[PDB]
mmCIF file with all atom_site columns, N, CA and C in Angstrom:
data_model
loop_
_atom_site.group_PDB
_atom_site.id
_atom_site.type_symbol
_atom_site.label_atom_id
_atom_site.label_alt_id
_atom_site.label_comp_id
_atom_site.label_asym_id
_atom_site.label_entity_id
_atom_site.label_seq_id
_atom_site.pdbx_PDB_ins_code
_atom_site.Cartn_x
_atom_site.Cartn_y
_atom_site.Cartn_z
_atom_site.occupancy
_atom_site.B_iso_or_equiv
_atom_site.pdbx_formal_charge
_atom_site.auth_seq_id
_atom_site.auth_comp_id
_atom_site.auth_asym_id
_atom_site.auth_atom_id
_atom_site.pdbx_PDB_model_num
ATOM 1   N N  . UNK A 1 1  ? 108.364 66.806 136.843 1.00 57.63 ? 10 UNK A N  1
ATOM 2   C CA . UNK A 1 1  ? 107.300 67.656 135.608 1.00 57.63 ? 10 UNK A CA 1
ATOM 3   C C  . UNK A 1 1  ? 107.798 69.118 135.411 1.00 57.63 ? 10 UNK A C  1
ATOM 4   N N  . UNK A 1 2  ? 107.897 69.761 136.995 1.00 59.19 ? 11 UNK A N  1
ATOM 5   C CA . UNK A 1 2  ? 108.176 71.259 136.655 1.00 59.19 ? 11 UNK A CA 1
ATOM 6   C C  . UNK A 1 2  ? 107.338 72.039 135.823 1.00 59.19 ? 11 UNK A C  1
ATOM 7   N N  . UNK A 1 3  ? 106.002 72.395 136.823 1.00 54.63 ? 12 UNK A N  1
ATOM 8   C CA . UNK A 1 3  ? 105.066 73.027 135.925 1.00 54.63 ? 12 UNK A CA 1
ATOM 9   C C  . UNK A 1 3  ? 105.504 74.694 135.818 1.00 54.63 ? 12 UNK A C  1
ATOM 10  N N  . UNK A 1 4  ? 104.906 75.402 135.138 1.00 55.67 ? 13 UNK A N  1
ATOM 11  C CA . UNK A 1 4  ? 104.972 76.810 134.653 1.00 55.67 ? 13 UNK A CA 1
ATOM 12  C C  . UNK A 1 4  ? 105.533 77.758 136.060 1.00 55.67 ? 13 UNK A C  1
ATOM 13  N N  . UNK A 1 5  ? 106.844 78.264 136.238 1.00 58.04 ? 14 UNK A N  1
ATOM 14  C CA . UNK A 1 5  ? 107.492 78.677 137.051 1.00 58.04 ? 14 UNK A CA 1
ATOM 15  C C  . UNK A 1 5  ? 106.850 80.278 137.079 1.00 58.04 ? 14 UNK A C  1
ATOM 16  N N  . UNK A 1 6  ? 105.983 80.782 136.078 1.00 57.66 ? 15 UNK A N  1
ATOM 17  C CA . UNK A 1 6  ? 105.475 81.821 136.075 1.00 57.66 ? 15 UNK A CA 1
ATOM 18  C C  . UNK A 1 6  ? 103.993 82.027 136.106 1.00 57.66 ? 15 UNK A C  1
ATOM 19  N N  . UNK A 1 7  ? 104.019 82.293 136.887 1.00 54.90 ? 16 UNK A N  1
ATOM 20  C CA . UNK A 1 7  ? 102.177 82.434 137.083 1.00 54.90 ? 16 UNK A CA 1
ATOM 21  C C  . UNK A 1 7  ? 101.626 83.686 136.047 1.00 54.90 ? 16 UNK A C  1
ATOM 22  N N  . UNK A 1 8  ? 102.437 84.506 136.423 1.00 53.82 ? 17 UNK A N  1
ATOM 23  C CA . UNK A 1 8  ? 101.912 85.611 135.476 1.00 53.82 ? 17 UNK A CA 1
ATOM 24  C C  . UNK A 1 8  ? 102.898 86.138 134.466 1.00 53.82 ? 17 UNK A C  1
ATOM 25  N N  . UNK A 1 9  ? 103.006 86.898 133.274 1.00 52.10 ? 18 UNK A N  1
ATOM 26  C CA . UNK A 1 9  ? 103.767 87.132 132.125 1.00 52.10 ? 18 UNK A CA 1
ATOM 27  C C  . UNK A 1 9  ? 104.094 88.735 132.272 1.00 52.10 ? 18 UNK A C  1
ATOM 28  N N  . UNK A 1 10 ? 104.649 89.027 130.778 1.00 53.65 ? 19 UNK A N  1
ATOM 29  C CA . UNK A 1 10 ? 104.977 90.835 130.839 1.00 53.65 ? 19 UNK A CA 1
ATOM 30  C C  . UNK A 1 10 ? 103.978 91.044 129.156 1.00 53.65 ? 19 UNK A C  1
ATOM 31  N N  . UNK A 1 11 ? 103.109 92.242 129.836 1.00 51.96 ? 20 UNK A N  1
ATOM 32  C CA . UNK A 1 11 ? 102.199 92.706 128.800 1.00 51.96 ? 20 UNK A CA 1
ATOM 33  C C  . UNK A 1 11 ? 103.133 93.751 128.255 1.00 51.96 ? 20 UNK A C  1
ATOM 34  N N  . UNK A 1 12 ? 103.824 94.371 128.956 1.00 53.12 ? 21 UNK A N  1
ATOM 35  C CA . UNK A 1 12 ? 104.319 95.763 128.241 1.00 53.12 ? 21 UNK A CA 1
ATOM 36  C C  . UNK A 1 12 ? 105.682 95.475 127.578 1.00 53.12 ? 21 UNK A C  1
ATOM 37  N N  . UNK A 1 13 ? 105.814 95.666 126.572 1.00 51.99 ? 22 UNK A N  1
ATOM 38  C CA . UNK A 1 13 ? 107.039 95.672 125.582 1.00 51.99 ? 22 UNK A CA 1
ATOM 39  C C  . UNK A 1 13 ? 108.221 96.375 126.054 1.00 51.99 ? 22 UNK A C  1
ATOM 40  N N  . UNK A 1 14 ? 109.362 96.105 125.680 1.00 55.08 ? 23 UNK A N  1
ATOM 41  C CA . UNK A 1 14 ? 110.974 96.502 126.092 1.00 55.08 ? 23 UNK A CA 1
ATOM 42  C C  . UNK A 1 14 ? 111.689 96.170 125.409 1.00 55.08 ? 23 UNK A C  1
ATOM 43  N N  . UNK A 1 15 ? 112.977 96.779 125.105 1.00 54.80 ? 24 UNK A N  1
ATOM 44  C CA . UNK A 1 15 ? 114.065 96.609 124.131 1.00 54.80 ? 24 UNK A CA 1
ATOM 45  C C  . UNK A 1 15 ? 114.570 95.402 124.607 1.00 54.80 ? 24 UNK A C  1
ATOM 46  N N  . UNK A 1 16 ? 115.160 94.417 123.829 1.00 51.65 ? 25 UNK A N  1
ATOM 47  C CA . UNK A 1 16 ? 115.741 93.022 123.902 1.00 51.65 ? 25 UNK A CA 1
ATOM 48  C C  . UNK A 1 16 ? 117.063 93.381 124.396 1.00 51.65 ? 25 UNK A C  1
ATOM 49  N N  . UNK A 1 17 ? 118.186 93.610 123.632 1.00 52.51 ? 26 UNK A N  1
ATOM 50  C CA . UNK A 1 17 ? 119.298 94.053 124.050 1.00 52.51 ? 26 UNK A CA 1
ATOM 51  C C  . UNK A 1 17 ? 119.669 94.254 125.643 1.00 52.51 ? 26 UNK A C  1
ATOM 52  N N  . UNK A 1 18 ? 118.842 94.578 126.251 1.00 50.43 ? 27 UNK A N  1
ATOM 53  C CA . UNK A 1 18 ? 119.002 94.989 127.787 1.00 50.43 ? 27 UNK A CA 1
ATOM 54  C C  . UNK A 1 18 ? 118.875 93.448 128.457 1.00 50.43 ? 27 UNK A C  1
ATOM 55  N N  . UNK A 1 19 ? 117.993 92.620 128.156 1.00 52.08 ? 28 UNK A N  1
ATOM 56  C CA . UNK A 1 19 ? 118.313 90.986 128.455 1.00 52.08 ? 28 UNK A CA 1
ATOM 57  C C  . UNK A 1 19 ? 119.107 90.786 128.387 1.00 52.08 ? 28 UNK A C  1
ATOM 58  N N  . UNK A 1 20 ? 120.002 90.016 129.731 1.00 51.83 ? 29 UNK A N  1
ATOM 59  C CA . UNK A 1 20 ? 121.368 89.660 129.024 1.00 51.83 ? 29 UNK A CA 1
ATOM 60  C C  . UNK A 1 20 ? 121.212 87.802 129.178 1.00 51.83 ? 29 UNK A C  1
ATOM 61  N N  . UNK A 1 21 ? 119.934 87.609 129.324 1.00 52.46 ? 30 UNK A N  1
ATOM 62  C CA . UNK A 1 21 ? 119.967 85.936 129.297 1.00 52.46 ? 30 UNK A CA 1
ATOM 63  C C  . UNK A 1 21 ? 118.287 85.632 128.905 1.00 52.46 ? 30 UNK A C  1
ATOM 64  N N  . UNK A 1 22 ? 117.945 85.612 127.687 1.00 53.52 ? 31 UNK A N  1
ATOM 65  C CA . UNK A 1 22 ? 116.650 85.252 127.406 1.00 53.52 ? 31 UNK A CA 1
ATOM 66  C C  . UNK A 1 22 ? 116.467 83.910 127.356 1.00 53.52 ? 31 UNK A C  1
ATOM 67  N N  . UNK A 1 23 ? 115.635 83.501 128.084 1.00 50.61 ? 32 UNK A N  1
ATOM 68  C CA . UNK A 1 23 ? 115.644 81.824 127.997 1.00 50.61 ? 32 UNK A CA 1
ATOM 69  C C  . UNK A 1 23 ? 114.002 81.479 128.055 1.00 50.61 ? 32 UNK A C  1
ATOM 70  N N  . UNK A 1 24 ? 113.729 80.979 126.809 1.00 52.97 ? 33 UNK A N  1
ATOM 71  C CA . UNK A 1 24 ? 112.076 80.532 127.264 1.00 52.97 ? 33 UNK A CA 1
ATOM 72  C C  . UNK A 1 24 ? 111.879 79.337 127.289 1.00 52.97 ? 33 UNK A C  1
ATOM 73  N N  . UNK A 1 25 ? 110.489 78.959 128.434 1.00 52.87 ? 34 UNK A N  1
ATOM 74  C CA . UNK A 1 25 ? 110.042 77.840 128.707 1.00 52.87 ? 34 UNK A CA 1
ATOM 75  C C  . UNK A 1 25 ? 109.836 76.680 127.569 1.00 52.87 ? 34 UNK A C  1
ATOM 76  N N  . UNK A 1 26 ? 109.978 75.307 127.419 1.00 49.80 ? 35 UNK A N  1
ATOM 77  C CA . UNK A 1 26 ? 109.220 74.659 126.400 1.00 49.80 ? 35 UNK A CA 1
ATOM 78  C C  . UNK A 1 26 ? 107.527 74.189 126.931 1.00 49.80 ? 35 UNK A C  1
ATOM 79  N N  . UNK A 1 27 ? 106.853 73.812 126.031 1.00 48.94 ? 36 UNK A N  1
ATOM 80  C CA . UNK A 1 27 ? 105.703 73.327 126.655 1.00 48.94 ? 36 UNK A CA 1
ATOM 81  C C  . UNK A 1 27 ? 105.440 71.942 126.350 1.00 48.94 ? 36 UNK A C  1
ATOM 82  N N  . UNK A 1 28 ? 104.566 71.368 127.562 1.00 50.66 ? 37 UNK A N  1
ATOM 83  C CA . UNK A 1 28 ? 104.242 69.901 127.689 1.00 50.66 ? 37 UNK A CA 1
ATOM 84  C C  . UNK A 1 28 ? 103.355 69.720 128.567 1.00 50.66 ? 37 UNK A C  1
ATOM 85  N N  . UNK A 1 29 ? 102.974 68.277 129.612 1.00 53.29 ? 38 UNK A N  1
ATOM 86  C CA . UNK A 1 29 ? 102.370 68.016 130.763 1.00 53.29 ? 38 UNK A CA 1
ATOM 87  C C  . UNK A 1 29 ? 102.358 69.115 131.734 1.00 53.29 ? 38 UNK A C  1
ATOM 88  N N  . UNK A 1 30 ? 103.524 69.197 131.752 1.00 52.41 ? 39 UNK A N  1
ATOM 89  C CA . UNK A 1 30 ? 104.055 69.995 133.387 1.00 52.41 ? 39 UNK A CA 1
ATOM 90  C C  . UNK A 1 30 ? 103.243 71.486 133.099 1.00 52.41 ? 39 UNK A C  1
ATOM 91  N N  . UNK A 1 31 ? 103.089 72.287 131.648 1.00 49.57 ? 40 UNK A N  1
ATOM 92  C CA . UNK A 1 31 ? 102.620 73.337 131.510 1.00 49.57 ? 40 UNK A CA 1
ATOM 93  C C  . UNK A 1 31 ? 102.185 73.189 130.128 1.00 49.57 ? 40 UNK A C  1
ATOM 94  N N  . UNK A 1 32 ? 100.880 73.159 129.756 1.00 48.82 ? 41 UNK A N  1
ATOM 95  C CA . UNK A 1 32 ? 100.321 73.578 128.400 1.00 48.82 ? 41 UNK A CA 1
ATOM 96  C C  . UNK A 1 32 ? 100.835 74.776 127.779 1.00 48.82 ? 41 UNK A C  1
ATOM 97  N N  . UNK A 1 33 ? 100.523 75.728 128.112 1.00 50.17 ? 42 UNK A N  1
ATOM 98  C CA . UNK A 1 33 ? 100.884 77.160 127.747 1.00 50.17 ? 42 UNK A CA 1
ATOM 99  C C  . UNK A 1 33 ? 102.523 77.233 128.006 1.00 50.17 ? 42 UNK A C  1
ATOM 100 N N  . UNK A 1 34 ? 103.205 77.993 126.616 1.00 50.22 ? 43 UNK A N  1
ATOM 101 C CA . UNK A 1 34 ? 104.341 78.015 126.593 1.00 50.22 ? 43 UNK A CA 1
ATOM 102 C C  . UNK A 1 34 ? 104.599 79.279 127.598 1.00 50.22 ? 43 UNK A C  1
ATOM 103 N N  . UNK A 1 35 ? 106.094 79.784 127.983 1.00 47.71 ? 44 UNK A N  1
ATOM 104 C CA . UNK A 1 35 ? 106.155 80.978 128.672 1.00 47.71 ? 44 UNK A CA 1
ATOM 105 C C  . UNK A 1 35 ? 107.427 81.271 128.563 1.00 47.71 ? 44 UNK A C  1
ATOM 106 N N  . UNK A 1 36 ? 107.808 83.004 128.317 1.00 49.80 ? 45 UNK A N  1
ATOM 107 C CA . UNK A 1 36 ? 109.343 83.110 128.153 1.00 49.80 ? 45 UNK A CA 1
ATOM 108 C C  . UNK A 1 36 ? 109.708 83.410 129.620 1.00 49.80 ? 45 UNK A C  1
ATOM 109 N N  . UNK A 1 37 ? 111.370 83.757 129.178 1.00 47.34 ? 46 UNK A N  1
ATOM 110 C CA . UNK A 1 37 ? 111.778 84.201 130.709 1.00 47.34 ? 46 UNK A CA 1
ATOM 111 C C  . UNK A 1 37 ? 113.222 84.806 130.541 1.00 47.34 ? 46 UNK A C  1
ATOM 112 N N  . UNK A 1 38 ? 113.093 86.076 130.449 1.00 46.25 ? 47 UNK A N  1
ATOM 113 C CA . UNK A 1 38 ? 114.396 86.711 129.979 1.00 46.25 ? 47 UNK A CA 1
ATOM 114 C C  . UNK A 1 38 ? 114.959 87.182 131.551 1.00 46.25 ? 47 UNK A C  1
ATOM 115 N N  . UNK A 1 39 ? 116.127 87.923 131.583 1.00 47.86 ? 48 UNK A N  1
ATOM 116 C CA . UNK A 1 39 ? 116.729 88.236 132.683 1.00 47.86 ? 48 UNK A CA 1
ATOM 117 C C  . UNK A 1 39 ? 117.030 89.554 132.343 1.00 47.86 ? 48 UNK A C  1
ATOM 118 N N  . UNK A 1 40 ? 116.964 90.447 132.787 1.00 46.49 ? 49 UNK A N  1
ATOM 119 C CA . UNK A 1 40 ? 117.450 91.990 132.617 1.00 46.49 ? 49 UNK A CA 1
ATOM 120 C C  . UNK A 1 40 ? 118.698 92.116 133.206 1.00 46.49 ? 49 UNK A C  1
ATOM 121 N N  . UNK A 1 41 ? 119.465 92.988 132.511 1.00 46.10 ? 50 UNK A N  1
ATOM 122 C CA . UNK A 1 41 ? 120.949 93.286 132.879 1.00 46.10 ? 50 UNK A CA 1
ATOM 123 C C  . UNK A 1 41 ? 120.882 93.443 134.234 1.00 46.10 ? 50 UNK A C  1
ATOM 124 N N  . UNK A 1 42 ? 120.088 94.003 135.020 1.00 44.96 ? 51 UNK A N  1
ATOM 125 C CA . UNK A 1 42 ? 120.049 94.778 136.370 1.00 44.96 ? 51 UNK A CA 1
ATOM 126 C C  . UNK A 1 42 ? 119.826 93.895 137.265 1.00 44.96 ? 51 UNK A C  1
ATOM 127 N N  . UNK A 1 43 ? 120.034 92.218 136.589 1.00 42.10 ? 52 UNK A N  1
ATOM 128 C CA . UNK A 1 43 ? 119.583 91.651 138.114 1.00 42.10 ? 52 UNK A CA 1
ATOM 129 C C  . UNK A 1 43 ? 118.178 91.351 137.954 1.00 42.10 ? 52 UNK A C  1
ATOM 130 N N  . UNK A 1 44 ? 117.109 91.615 137.145 1.00 41.24 ? 53 UNK A N  1
ATOM 131 C CA . UNK A 1 44 ? 115.659 91.304 136.881 1.00 41.24 ? 53 UNK A CA 1
ATOM 132 C C  . UNK A 1 44 ? 115.730 90.044 136.088 1.00 41.24 ? 53 UNK A C  1
ATOM 133 N N  . UNK A 1 45 ? 114.074 89.376 136.593 1.00 39.54 ? 54 UNK A N  1
ATOM 134 C CA . UNK A 1 45 ? 113.509 87.985 135.607 1.00 39.54 ? 54 UNK A CA 1
ATOM 135 C C  . UNK A 1 45 ? 112.305 88.581 135.478 1.00 39.54 ? 54 UNK A C  1
ATOM 136 N N  . UNK A 1 46 ? 112.149 88.709 134.584 1.00 42.02 ? 55 UNK A N  1
ATOM 137 C CA . UNK A 1 46 ? 110.647 89.112 133.692 1.00 42.02 ? 55 UNK A CA 1
ATOM 138 C C  . UNK A 1 46 ? 110.054 88.001 132.919 1.00 42.02 ? 55 UNK A C  1
ATOM 139 N N  . UNK A 1 47 ? 108.914 87.566 133.695 1.00 42.98 ? 56 UNK A N  1
ATOM 140 C CA . UNK A 1 47 ? 108.588 86.412 132.130 1.00 42.98 ? 56 UNK A CA 1
ATOM 141 C C  . UNK A 1 47 ? 107.726 87.223 130.982 1.00 42.98 ? 56 UNK A C  1
ATOM 142 N N  . UNK A 1 48 ? 107.692 86.551 129.889 1.00 42.85 ? 57 UNK A N  1
ATOM 143 C CA . UNK A 1 48 ? 107.273 87.361 128.767 1.00 42.85 ? 57 UNK A CA 1
ATOM 144 C C  . UNK A 1 48 ? 105.696 86.829 128.319 1.00 42.85 ? 57 UNK A C  1
ATOM 145 N N  . UNK A 1 49 ? 105.185 87.467 127.720 1.00 43.86 ? 58 UNK A N  1
ATOM 146 C CA . UNK A 1 49 ? 103.540 86.761 126.986 1.00 43.86 ? 58 UNK A CA 1
ATOM 147 C C  . UNK A 1 49 ? 103.614 86.848 125.499 1.00 43.86 ? 58 UNK A C  1
ATOM 148 N N  . UNK A 1 50 ? 103.595 85.430 125.079 1.00 43.38 ? 59 UNK A N  1
ATOM 149 C CA . UNK A 1 50 ? 104.047 85.540 123.387 1.00 43.38 ? 59 UNK A CA 1
ATOM 150 C C  . UNK A 1 50 ? 102.367 85.858 123.165 1.00 43.38 ? 59 UNK A C  1
ATOM 151 N N  . UNK A 1 51 ? 101.264 85.688 123.664 1.00 47.03 ? 60 UNK A N  1
ATOM 152 C CA . UNK A 1 51 ? 100.062 86.554 123.087 1.00 47.03 ? 60 UNK A CA 1
ATOM 153 C C  . UNK A 1 51 ? 100.574 87.745 122.070 1.00 47.03 ? 60 UNK A C  1
ATOM 154 N N  . UNK A 1 52 ? 101.121 88.802 122.785 1.00 45.03 ? 61 UNK A N  1
ATOM 155 C CA . UNK A 1 52 ? 101.886 90.017 122.303 1.00 45.03 ? 61 UNK A CA 1
ATOM 156 C C  . UNK A 1 52 ? 102.546 89.665 120.774 1.00 45.03 ? 61 UNK A C  1
ATOM 157 N N  . UNK A 1 53 ? 102.631 90.728 120.288 1.00 47.03 ? 62 UNK A N  1
ATOM 158 C CA . UNK A 1 53 ? 103.571 90.921 118.333 1.00 47.03 ? 62 UNK A CA 1
ATOM 159 C C  . UNK A 1 53 ? 104.797 91.101 119.147 1.00 47.03 ? 62 UNK A C  1
ATOM 160 N N  . UNK A 1 54 ? 105.118 91.728 120.264 1.00 47.09 ? 63 UNK A N  1
ATOM 161 C CA . UNK A 1 54 ? 106.173 92.340 120.489 1.00 47.09 ? 63 UNK A CA 1
ATOM 162 C C  . UNK A 1 54 ? 107.551 91.183 121.256 1.00 47.09 ? 63 UNK A C  1
ATOM 163 N N  . UNK A 1 55 ? 106.377 90.320 121.867 1.00 49.69 ? 64 UNK A N  1
ATOM 164 C CA . UNK A 1 55 ? 107.315 89.322 122.787 1.00 49.69 ? 64 UNK A CA 1
ATOM 165 C C  . UNK A 1 55 ? 107.867 88.475 121.913 1.00 49.69 ? 64 UNK A C  1
ATOM 166 N N  . UNK A 1 56 ? 107.154 87.834 121.176 1.00 48.14 ? 65 UNK A N  1
ATOM 167 C CA . UNK A 1 56 ? 107.433 86.774 119.588 1.00 48.14 ? 65 UNK A CA 1
ATOM 168 C C  . UNK A 1 56 ? 108.657 87.417 118.667 1.00 48.14 ? 65 UNK A C  1
ATOM 169 N N  . UNK A 1 57 ? 108.225 88.981 118.545 1.00 48.39 ? 66 UNK A N  1
ATOM 170 C CA . UNK A 1 57 ? 109.492 89.320 117.508 1.00 48.39 ? 66 UNK A CA 1
ATOM 171 C C  . UNK A 1 57 ? 110.456 89.833 118.380 1.00 48.39 ? 66 UNK A C  1
ATOM 172 N N  . UNK A 1 58 ? 110.543 90.253 119.463 1.00 46.84 ? 67 UNK A N  1
ATOM 173 C CA . UNK A 1 58 ? 111.765 90.178 120.351 1.00 46.84 ? 67 UNK A CA 1
ATOM 174 C C  . UNK A 1 58 ? 112.389 89.003 120.651 1.00 46.84 ? 67 UNK A C  1
ATOM 175 N N  . UNK A 1 59 ? 111.783 87.839 120.969 1.00 44.26 ? 68 UNK A N  1
ATOM 176 C CA . UNK A 1 59 ? 112.210 86.330 121.664 1.00 44.26 ? 68 UNK A CA 1
ATOM 177 C C  . UNK A 1 59 ? 112.997 86.178 119.874 1.00 44.26 ? 68 UNK A C  1
ATOM 178 N N  . UNK A 1 60 ? 112.170 86.504 118.741 1.00 42.59 ? 69 UNK A N  1
ATOM 179 C CA . UNK A 1 60 ? 112.693 85.689 117.318 1.00 42.59 ? 69 UNK A CA 1
ATOM 180 C C  . UNK A 1 60 ? 114.008 86.768 117.276 1.00 42.59 ? 69 UNK A C  1
ATOM 181 N N  . UNK A 1 61 ? 113.858 88.098 117.437 1.00 40.69 ? 70 UNK A N  1
ATOM 182 C CA . UNK A 1 61 ? 115.452 89.023 116.977 1.00 40.69 ? 70 UNK A CA 1
ATOM 183 C C  . UNK A 1 61 ? 116.115 88.823 117.687 1.00 40.69 ? 70 UNK A C  1
ATOM 184 N N  . UNK A 1 62 ? 116.128 88.034 119.124 1.00 41.69 ? 71 UNK A N  1
ATOM 185 C CA . UNK A 1 62 ? 116.835 88.036 119.936 1.00 41.69 ? 71 UNK A CA 1
ATOM 186 C C  . UNK A 1 62 ? 117.410 86.300 119.745 1.00 41.69 ? 71 UNK A C  1
ATOM 187 N N  . UNK A 1 63 ? 116.756 85.674 119.466 1.00 42.84 ? 72 UNK A N  1
ATOM 188 C CA . UNK A 1 63 ? 117.252 84.248 119.446 1.00 42.84 ? 72 UNK A CA 1
ATOM 189 C C  . UNK A 1 63 ? 117.498 84.018 117.756 1.00 42.84 ? 72 UNK A C  1
ATOM 190 N N  . UNK A 1 64 ? 117.120 84.422 116.971 1.00 45.49 ? 73 UNK A N  1
ATOM 191 C CA . UNK A 1 64 ? 118.086 84.721 115.961 1.00 45.49 ? 73 UNK A CA 1
ATOM 192 C C  . UNK A 1 64 ? 119.153 85.440 115.738 1.00 45.49 ? 73 UNK A C  1
ATOM 193 N N  . UNK A 1 65 ? 120.130 84.356 115.364 1.00 46.00 ? 74 UNK A N  1
ATOM 194 C CA . UNK A 1 65 ? 121.577 84.969 115.829 1.00 46.00 ? 74 UNK A CA 1
ATOM 195 C C  . UNK A 1 65 ? 122.921 83.944 115.287 1.00 46.00 ? 74 UNK A C  1
ATOM 196 N N  . UNK A 1 66 ? 124.115 84.061 115.573 1.00 48.70 ? 75 UNK A N  1
ATOM 197 C CA . UNK A 1 66 ? 124.920 82.929 115.472 1.00 48.70 ? 75 UNK A CA 1
ATOM 198 C C  . UNK A 1 66 ? 124.870 82.363 116.926 1.00 48.70 ? 75 UNK A C  1
ATOM 199 N N  . UNK A 1 67 ? 124.578 81.051 116.245 1.00 46.87 ? 76 UNK A N  1
ATOM 200 C CA . UNK A 1 67 ? 124.481 80.130 117.808 1.00 46.87 ? 76 UNK A CA 1
ATOM 201 C C  . UNK A 1 67 ? 125.661 79.213 117.480 1.00 46.87 ? 76 UNK A C  1
ATOM 202 N N  . UNK A 1 68 ? 126.162 78.148 116.331 1.00 49.56 ? 77 UNK A N  1
ATOM 203 C CA . UNK A 1 68 ? 127.174 77.446 116.549 1.00 49.56 ? 77 UNK A CA 1
ATOM 204 C C  . UNK A 1 68 ? 127.707 77.777 114.828 1.00 49.56 ? 77 UNK A C  1
ATOM 205 N N  . UNK A 1 69 ? 129.293 77.143 114.864 1.00 47.58 ? 78 UNK A N  1
ATOM 206 C CA . UNK A 1 69 ? 129.828 77.119 113.873 1.00 47.58 ? 78 UNK A CA 1
ATOM 207 C C  . UNK A 1 69 ? 129.808 78.127 113.050 1.00 47.58 ? 78 UNK A C  1
#
């Protein structure tokens, strides 16, 4: 199952290119609410809150890019 590994999230906004690895966690029975999880280049890990418009815009601008082919 693996429930939400982030009990709290990030409400303050920040520039995305700093994130070396932006990976969001999917939702399901393990966790009804979806949670984001970026990894700052300084070796930090901050879960983001999609309730804001910057977290969802930052994840969209960071995810929307060359993926394959």
